[PDB]
Amino acid sequence: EDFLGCLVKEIPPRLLYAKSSPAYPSVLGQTIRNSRWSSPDNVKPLYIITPTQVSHIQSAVVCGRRHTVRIRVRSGGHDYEGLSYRSLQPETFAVVDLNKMRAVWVDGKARTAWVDSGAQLGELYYAIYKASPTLAFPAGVCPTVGVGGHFAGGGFGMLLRKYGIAAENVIDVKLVDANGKLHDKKSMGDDHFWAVRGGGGESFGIVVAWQVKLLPVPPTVTIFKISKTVSEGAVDIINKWQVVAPQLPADLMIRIIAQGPKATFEAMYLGTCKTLTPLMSSKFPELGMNPSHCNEMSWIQSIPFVHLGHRDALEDDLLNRQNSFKPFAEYKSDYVYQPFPKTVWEQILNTWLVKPGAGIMIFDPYGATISATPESATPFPHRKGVLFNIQYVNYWFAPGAAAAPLSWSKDIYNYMEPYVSKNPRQAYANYRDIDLGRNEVVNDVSTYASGKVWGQKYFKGNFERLAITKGKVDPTDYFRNEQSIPPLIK
Ligand SMILES: *Cc1cc2c(nc3c(=O)[nH]c(=O)nc-3n2C[C@H](O)[C@H](O)[C@H](O)COP(=O)(O)OP(=O)(O)OC[C@H]2O[C@@H](n3cnc4c(N)ncnc43)[C@H](O)[C@@H]2O)c(*)c1C
Ligand SMILES: [Cl-]
Ligand code: NA
Ligand code: NA
């Protein structure tokens, strides 16, 4: 009652939603991306606040502290476990939903931009394009992902070999801390500014906006998508890829998608077909690339082309808030440091990807710029020595059909254990997976020991620094979820 009373005192009431508000179901659902988490059995927020100004965010946080109601912040809603808008067990929380805070102000000459956290990646990319056809920003492949959660968790895409992760191309932030105080890099200090850029969402406060550096790209880039079935030699070709791809020049990234006994090699090359063709013949002739495979286009056009295979619908693909795609979805991830034996590739392609409920596997090669950053330089630790990341993606489209895909996801993770990183088994924070472990709360504070179990998987040797920083900026564990950094205090 009095939390709401506090809010109503400080924030326009049209931006406040209670469970009985006519628009509450629509507002809650607008950026839910996973049909597992939209159904009525999920724990729902007591209130939703949709700020349009930073002062609204500050007021909400102050009210939450005064009245001990915790807040889960949502930007784009893509959290794989829905932790921006649901809790796992019954509890009281509000959602602060930033979708109305979505401005992207580009300074083309300075090669910087201020990007509100509620902007989607496609809007960031498009605004850069409206300023220049030869500037880019290295973030993810999915246009509807929110800036806020993506940057907080690191963020990587088809420019990761050239420029690293999104969070390491952030030069300032505007942030509201657990006390409602507005911060930037200077006021935050080294530890807090280190942590917020890749240490995971929620834990380190609400980032309102991010200042980014913009990076040059050639006026023409080249994409190819070359598939090989097992009959066409996929096993031998992927067995070569895993050694070659992380060693290729920074201008060339060749990822793989597999969803049966066939691998699709998807490349983005910062250059022309004319130079790509001989590069491929020299470094990876086994793929059989020739100029007919080239698709030359602008960098901005590569975003819909890579993700959707579209060539012709730039605005529709990048400026999309309809939320039409809502699979039931499960996700896992791994990091690989040692090449798989050929027999493991055989099993993956011929056996694991031909099972009931089998998902898709996406393999992103590292090396080059992402791997040149030291493991501790940012919270994202998956750097030197990484050959590739694996994402295991399971989509399905019927309620009551979760058993088979969920079992497959668990079973393949067990199969892969001997071949991927260990001690700890590394995972990417933005590919959130609650089965890696969850927090225990004691005396209303997430415990350090429970956080460490999953935290070392996402953050390796950076976990303790994250937790000490958490203890300094939020000792009472105000901004938390089931898998957020616990405070480590004296
Ligand atoms: C759905 C989806 C996700 C993808 C896709 N492709 C990706 C890619 O090419 N590269 C990647 O690096 N990641 C990809 N992912 C995963 C996303 O990066 C993650 O799912 C992001 O965490 C999503 O961010 P967002 O859409 O903003 O999701 P939310 O659910 O709102 O938040 C996630 C997490 O972060 C906290 N949080 C949100 N907003 C803030 C702010 N402003 N400040 C701090 N913390 C914030 C939330 O509370 C939550 O814990 C492709 C597709 C299709
Ligand atoms: Cl996620
Ligand atoms: Na290890
Ligand atoms: Na999951």
UniProtKB/TrEMBL annotation:
Q: Give this protein's Gene Ontology molecular function annotations.
A: FAD binding; oxidoreductase activity
Keywords, A to Z?
Answer: FAD, Flavoprotein, Glycoprotein, Nucleotide-binding, Signal
Binding of FAD occurs at 73, 75-79, 84, 141-142, 146, 149-150, 156, 202, 207, 428, 430, 432
According to its UniProt record, which cofactors does this protein need? FAD
Q: Which Pfam families match?
A: BBE, FAD_binding_4
UniProt keyword S-adenosyl-L-methionine, yes or no: no
Span of domain FAD-binding PCMH-type: 41-217
Q: Which cysteines are joined by disulfide bonds?
A: 6-63, 273-294
The record's listing under InterPro entries reads: BBE, FAD-bd_PCMH, FAD-bd_PCMH-like_sf, FAD-bd_PCMH_sub1, FAD-bd_PCMH_sub2, Oxid_FAD_bind_N
Q: Does the keyword Nucleotide-binding apply?
A: yes
What family is this protein classified in? Belongs to the oxygen-dependent FAD-linked oxidoreductase family.
Q: Can you say what this protein is called? A: Pollen allergen Phl p 4.0202
Source organism of the structure: Phleum pratense
Q: What gene is behind this protein?
A: phlp4
